[PDB]
C-alpha cells in the first residue's frame, strides 16, 4: 500500500486560488482524486490542470515546473482517456471551472508507488487559465506524517 499525497494551493499576490488536491489509494488499482478549490478567476477559465515534471521552487515560479508529466508520450487531444498524458488530469476528467470547484474521481494512470514509472510523488500541479497562463501551482507532498507498520499518524 503506497502512501497518500496532497497538493496544497495557497493564496498570494499572484493568485487567489487556494485549496487542495488529494490523492488516496483506492480499489482496483486506481487512485482517488479529491479536488477542493476556491478563489478561481472564473471568467478566464475553464482551467486546465496537470501534473508537471519539476517541483515548484521557493520563488513560487509556476514556469519552473516545466512540462507536463508524460512518461508515455501522450497527446493533448484524445478520443479515449489512455491517449492523454498521465499528468493530464483535466484532459481526462474535465477542467476546473467556476469560482469554486469540488469534485472526486478515480484516475487509473497516476501512481502512488515510488517504484512505478507513473509515480507522481515529488512532482507538482499547475492550474492554468484557459489561454495557458499559469495561475497557481503546488508541490505534491505526503498527506500523513506517520508511516510504517508499527506506527500511528
Ligand atoms: Cu499544466
From Swiss-Prot:
Activity regulation details: Secreted in a disulfide-oxidized form and apo-pools of secreted SOD5 can readily capture extracellular copper for rapid induction of enzyme activity.
Cofactor note: Binds 1 copper ion per subunit.
Cofactor: Cu cation
A Gene Ontology biological process term: symbiont-mediated evasion of host immune response
EC code: 1.15.1.1
Gene Ontology MF term list: copper ion binding; superoxide dismutase activity
Knocked-out gene: effects: Leads to sensitivity to hydrogen peroxide when cells were grown in nutrient-limited conditions.
Residues reported to bind Cu cation: 50, 52, 68, 128
Glycosylation sites: 28, 61, 73, 131, 139, 151
Induction of the gene: Induced during yeast-to-hyphal transition and by osmotic and oxidative stresses. Expression is also increased when cells were grown on nonfermentable substrates as the only carbon source, in serum, and in the presence of neutrophils. Down-regulated by shikonin. Expression is controlled by EFG1, NRG1 and RIM101.
Compartments where located: Secreted, Cell wall; Membrane
PTM annotation: The GPI-anchor is attached to the protein in the endoplasmic reticulum and serves to target the protein to the cell surface. There, the glucosamine-inositol phospholipid moiety is cleaved off and the GPI-modified mannoprotein is covalently attached via its lipidless GPI glycan remnant to the 1,6-beta-glucan of the outer cell wall layer.
Highest rank taxon of the organism: Eukaryota
Top EC class for this record: oxidoreductase
Positions of disulphide bridges: 62-137
Entry keywords, A to Z: Antioxidant, Cell wall, Copper, Disulfide bond, Glycoprotein, GPI-anchor, Lipoprotein, Membrane, Metal-binding, Oxidoreductase, Secreted, Signal, Virulence
Role played: Superoxide dismutases serve to convert damaging superoxide radicals, a key form of ROS, to less damaging hydrogen peroxide that can be converted into water by catalase action. Degrades host-derived reactive oxygen species to escape innate immune surveillance. Involved in the occurrence of miconazole-tolerant persisters in biofilms. Persisters are cells that survive high doses of an antimicrobial agent.
Stated family: Belongs to the Cu-Zn superoxide dismutase family.
Protein name according to UniProt: Cell surface Cu-only superoxide dismutase 5
Gene that specifies this protein: SOD5
